[PDB]
Design a protein around this ligand. Structure first.
Ligand SMILES: N[C@H](C(=O)O)[C@H](O)COP(=O)(O)O
Ligand SMILES: [Zn+2]
Ligand SMILES: [Zn+2]
Lengths: 328, 328
């Protein structure tokens, strides 16, 4: 075997991302942590946190080495303008996107085994003149993936979303057999390839409350969800549902499920989030490479102040690492 | 101070209601338990269950006495036909309705401090030729309430819904400024008068994911929810602005709030039910009196078995009692 490299994008410079990566670095890792950011950004934020940091250069033509405590490997990307923790600078929006692109191309070219992302501020990137709606869409497009699936996990409890950031009013018409097929196909695929689960068991939420309670509250279950599920069950897929979302999240269901598929954003994320603020991991399924992420914002207000909380970033990294085994 | 009386309606005679009430009786209570039902029904179901039961008559002229274990106070209403657990008899629909009317009237008279309802089967009542649009609708209409708001609580969390059992595709257009003002006024009002919370703190969910994030994920927050909340805040009402549902359910928020207002069914109930479950109690806001209700159905398939589970009924009663204590 060979020591693996993972690429990490701290995210918004003025945000908590660099703070968190400097903190990640205070411990040992079984992989080489290739951080794609500006060297000075990290050096300065480290100082502000009274934390030690020595950076070694990313060297593609030398073997990778596990990351020792107090260090990080650096894939340099220059900042557009000077940084002040907590204050945004539109020009640095190009900087952020650049790190994302480079880290993404590194996973596509096989340079890196996984990609872990810090938080980014969508607003400032747009302000810079760059259409950006989030990492998920960014990688999906740059990776030219047919379709990606957003997942949230806290360990055994994993929730995927059939639809993501759509206005509530657009969800219903979005639930088509075509969409359910791709999403579930990907969910089933990745649970096997990336999560190492031979025969994955997926728990599916209905669209309406009470899963449509017959026909009194919506026809989507009887019209498209149920039919598709049985089309897939015949394909050998182990699927349970559709079930009511406020009943589905129980031991008699979860204990025998490897993942839950929610029809929409606020149907599945609240329970997961209430299951623990930190320790929550964002995962993108459907990409050619493993991509995990923190499950929180840039928290400009905390940047450089040292009240961090690297729990989510650390779990994100541990998961990506554990995931590398199943793919390599 | 003085011992209060609460009225309980076992509900559908053939369902588990009577079973649940006979078990409730096996323990002492700080209030007098007035059960509006047919004596024989209760006596018999007690036999079938191997549980002891002594019924004392409702004596409004006497001082209310806390209920002693193995006993119940009876407000007599006669069945129209013999009851066979697990079998619906249309004729008895008239019985169910009469108990509901009598209990309701008693709550408007001041005879009873609160109403705790057992499960009722709508179908059989309608099949009997009795117009009845639903359990809570009956009390809403008879008490002349203009609007009721459904809430689910567990001692550690209270969640009210702006909309209830509607198809998902109908929620967006239902969230109007009128509905919200009406829903929040009632929620603010009752948190004071029924829960005894002076200066109530309310958390409000946005309709869209990330609360519409600016307006990149929907406009309802900007066009309706935010304007409404602002007006109400102008009246001193403590309202924590529209927060993304997936971040709202967390200590920094919940620990600072008395109630959470969710926009739709699956946005609040899953968290509430994962945070407790059976501990869940349905409270009807908007009526002139306190009304709690079990969380299950008539479950005719369980009546007369012995595997009832008066748990939910107990948390329902316990909750109404507390509400009485904090409002006297
Ligand atoms: N709702 C997701 C979460 O809970 O983290 C978040 O929007 C994902 O954003 P990205 O596409 O930027 O990873
Ligand atoms: Zn999101
Ligand atoms: Zn419901």
């Amino acid at each position: 075997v060979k020591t693996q490299r993972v690429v990490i994008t701290p995210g918004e410079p003025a945000g908590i991302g660099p703070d968190l990566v400097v903190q990640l670095a205070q411990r040992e890792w079984p992989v080489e942590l290739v951080v794609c950011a500006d060297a000075t950004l990290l050096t300065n934020r480290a100082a502000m946190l009274g934390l030690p940091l020595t950076l070694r250069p990313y060297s593609p033509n030398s073997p990778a080495q596990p990351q020792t405590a107090g260090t990080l490997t650096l894939l340099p990307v220059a900042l557009r303008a000077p940084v002040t923790a907590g204050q945004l600078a539109v020009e640095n929006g190009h900087y952020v996107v650049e790190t994302l692109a480079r880290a993404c191309d590194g996973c596509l070219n096989g340079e890196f085994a996984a990609l872990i992302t810090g938080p980014v501020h969508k607003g400032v990137i747009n302000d810079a003149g760059i259409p950006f709606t989030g990492h998920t869409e960014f990688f999906e497009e740059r990776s030219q993936a047919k379709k990606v699936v957003m997942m949230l996990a806290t360990e055994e409890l994993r929730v995927a979303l059939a639809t993501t950031h759509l206005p509530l009013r657009d969800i219903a018409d979005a639930i088509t057999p075509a969409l359910l097929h791709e999403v579930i196909a990907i969910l089933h695929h990745d649970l096997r390839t990336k999560f190492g689960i031979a025969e994955p068991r997926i728990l599916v939420c209905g669209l309406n409350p009470h899963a449509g309670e017959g026909g009194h509250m919506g026809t989507e279950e009887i019209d498209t969800i149920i039919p598709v599920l049985n089309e897939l069950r015949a394909q050998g897929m182990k699927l349970n549902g559709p079930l009511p979302a406020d009943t589905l999240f129980q031991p008699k269901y979860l204990d025998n499920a490897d993942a839950v598929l929610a029809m929409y954003h606020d149907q599945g994320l609240p329970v997961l989030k209430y299951q623990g603020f930190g320790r929550g991991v964002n995962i993108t399924l459907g990409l050619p490479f493993i991509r995990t992420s923190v499950d929180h914002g840039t928290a400009l207000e905390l940047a450089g102040r040292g009240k961090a909380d690297v729990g989510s970033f650390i779990t994100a990294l541990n998961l990506a690492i554990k995931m590398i085994v199943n793919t390599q």
